[PDB]
Each structure stands twice: as structure tokens, then as C-alpha cells.
Design brief:
This protein is mainly beta and 207 residues long. The protein has 4 helices and 13 strands. It is classed as sweet tasting protein.
Length: 207
């Protein structure tokens, strides 16, 4: 499977890509404005994610920092990212089907489009101006908009039981971004496409 991570943002970003315990394809890139990087994701791959890192410096040694989605300090993300981050997440070939989906459970820090490039199903999207109306207590350290948990690490906000519920915060994201997860116990927003379908990820969708 191929994912086309297109960067439409007016700035530079370091798209990111991990299956959490490892990179997915090349793990990390940097695209300037209007650039795409094409990664081959392994078939049957479970639980990969793609996100975007903001405001960074990495040497000729793949280290450094990013105000957002910093993955243990390194270009080539082999590990998931530091909050706050719009979460592009897929599981492929789990019995004929594929699972695409965007989640704000890890916050928001860049608008995204995750859409199939094949025939089959729908893409999902979360391009509202989150940073723009982020509640000030979610107001982000880097230039994103943090999630309750990353902000209080309280039970409530963290679903630190299993038994959960919605919060005045979870719905800010949900009022804004309905097709994405605003919390764990969130009525899943998954979009089951066809097996082996190819996708396209877009940073700063039409707008």
C-alpha cells in the first residue's frame, strides 16, 4: 500500500509515520510547501499513524526538535508523536477490509485529509480551525490545541478507568470535527474501505 502525504500547508512540515514500535517506510520526511512524499506501507500493517510535525530543526544526524508532534527528537520517526497532533490512523487488511481514520484524541495542530485514492469508500477530514478556537486551557504549548488528558491527566479526561464520558472539551473537537475521535470512548468514526486500497493524506485540505 501507498500513502501520498501531500503538503498543502503554506509552510514547511515534517510529515510523520509510525506503526509505533517502528517506522512505516521511511518514518519521517520534511516537505516544503506544495510537496508530497510517497511511502509504501506494508500490507496487513496494523496500527500505523501519520501526523505532521511543526517548527523544527534536525541536523545532518536526524535529531533535533519540533514544537509539535515531536517523536522522541528525530526526523525519522520510529515512535509515535508528542502531542498535540491531528491523527491520521490506518490498519490494513484485517480480513478483506482496511480501516482508515483521523483522531483528535491526541489533540490538533494541523488540518488533514485522509482519503482513499482508489474506488471504494470515503475519506475523512478534520480541517476546521481548531487552533483558531481552541479553548485557552487547551491552548497549546507548541502551536496546536491540546486535548483534555494532555492537559490535566485527570481520570475523566483520560478514561483512566475504562468507563468513560464526554467532556466540555471533547465536544469542542466534536462540534468542530465530527468525523474524527474526540476521546477514547468515542463512538468510533472508522471508515472501512476495501482491502489493499491505496490512500492519499493531505495536510491543509481544500481551504
Amino acid at each position: 500500500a501507498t500513502f501520498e502525504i501531500v503538503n498543502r500547508c503554506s509552510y514547511t512540515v515534517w510529515a510523520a509515520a509510525s506503526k509505533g514500535d517502528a517506522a512505516l517506510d521511511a518514518g519521517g520526511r520534511q516537505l516544503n510547501s506544495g510537496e508530497s512524499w510517497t511511502i509504501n506501507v506494508e500490507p496487513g500493517t496494523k496500527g500505523g499513524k501519520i501526523w505532521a510535525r511543526t517548527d523544527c530543526y534536525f541536523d545532518d544526524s536526524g535529531s533535533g526538535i519540533c514544537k509539535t508532534g515531536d517523536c522522541g527528537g528525530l526526523l525519522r520517526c520510529k515512535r509515535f508523536g508528542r502531542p498535540p497532533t491531528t491523527l491520521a490512523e490506518f490498519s490494513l487488511n484485517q480480513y478483506g477490509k482496511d480501516y482508515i481514520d483521523i483522531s483528535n484524541i491526541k489533540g490538533f495542530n494541523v488540518p488533514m485529509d485522509f482519503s482513499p485514492t482508489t474506488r471504494g469508500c470515503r475519506g475523512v477530514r478534520c480541517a476546521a480551525d481548531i487552533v483558531g478556537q481552541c479553548p485557552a486551557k487547551l491552548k497549546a504549548p507548541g502551536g496546536g490545541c491540546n486535548d483534555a488528558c494532555t492537559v490535566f491527566q485527570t481520570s475523566e479526561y483520560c478514561c483512566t478507568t475504562g468507563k468513560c464520558g464526554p467532556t466540555e472539551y471533547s465536544r469542542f473537537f466534536k462540534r468542530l470535527c465530527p468525523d474524527a475521535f474526540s476521546y477514547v470512548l468515542d463512538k468510533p468514526t472508522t471508515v472501512t474501505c476495501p482491502g489493499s486500497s491505496n490512500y492519499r493524506v493531505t495536510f491543509c485540505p481544500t481551504a
